[PDB]
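Is adenosine-5'-diphosphate placement plausible here? Inputs below.
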Amino acid sequence: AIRPLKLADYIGQPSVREQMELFIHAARGRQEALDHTLIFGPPGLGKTTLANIIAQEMGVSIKSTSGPVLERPGDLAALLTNLEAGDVLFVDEIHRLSPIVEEVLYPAMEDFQLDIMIARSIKLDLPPFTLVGATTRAGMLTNPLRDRFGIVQRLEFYNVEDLATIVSRSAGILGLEIEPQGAAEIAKRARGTPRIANRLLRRVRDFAEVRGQGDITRVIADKALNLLDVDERGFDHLDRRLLLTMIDKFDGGPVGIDNLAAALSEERHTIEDVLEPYLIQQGYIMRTPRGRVVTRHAYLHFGLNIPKRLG
Ligand SMILES: Nc1ncnc2c1ncn2[C@@H]1O[C@H](COP(=O)(O)OP(=O)(O)O)[C@@H](O)[C@H]1O
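Reply from A.M.:
I modeled the complex. Tokens:
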């Protein structure tokens, strides 16, 4: 209900919205498939949502898959051969395609031709289609794959004013009364993401209905977020454990990503793709050639003294 199904409802990414509206209206005007589109940025920013909007606005079907799911060239082939003219094939986590599966994608995208080995090479014609790929950052794709995308959109963390607009819109859809400052409190602590802002709104609604009067106020939002263990900066338990581990076990860094992951019992990709991007963006962590380091702001956040020493 609250997820935008069309570009008109896509708030907080004006450049992306304006560009996509233009490219889609142009492709439809020519009765052609939209050019292959790459969407990148952090998780929860609406990559899957945008992919679905593309299919919706184009008036076509969307087939969704993921880089890890396509273990063999034939798995990709099966999807490609099942598309109708103009359909969207959405491949989330596209940077995790195995090098050999990625090879099949090159002619499928560029020439609408399937070229697969079975030994014998088989060449088959494909109907026009749109590949929508998503990854956390564009630089982690090869140059050949990257260069086959005709449209490239970059999603960035949302500013707090736009997140508040999104929270207020969602509250309206849910029939909830919300004060401006209530929407602001949630937006402030939503970690720059509409996914999180919307989830937090649902949990705040619960608190309002059970412990309050049913409406969303700044005080109700604050108490509810405190119960959820989400702090004033939008940091959750894992975010704080990451920063505190860097401070306590590694003296603030520098610490290599593998050492940090092992110290947290978390995988590398989790720290790099899920935890770190917002923390770096907000100025709490910095990457250096010798490893990640916390900034003085990490110490200040926890009421700790800033150490003064040499590097
Ligand atoms: N521009 C936007 N405006 C309002 N809500 C959004 C926007 N982008 C995403 N959302 C919301 O955030 C959620 C996350 O979208 P999703 O496509 O799953 O992100 P990703 O695929 O990047 O992890 C969606 O369920 C949707 O409700």
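Short version: Residues 2-4, 10-13, 43-49, 166, 194-195, 198 surround adenosine-5'-diphosphate (CB under 6 Å).
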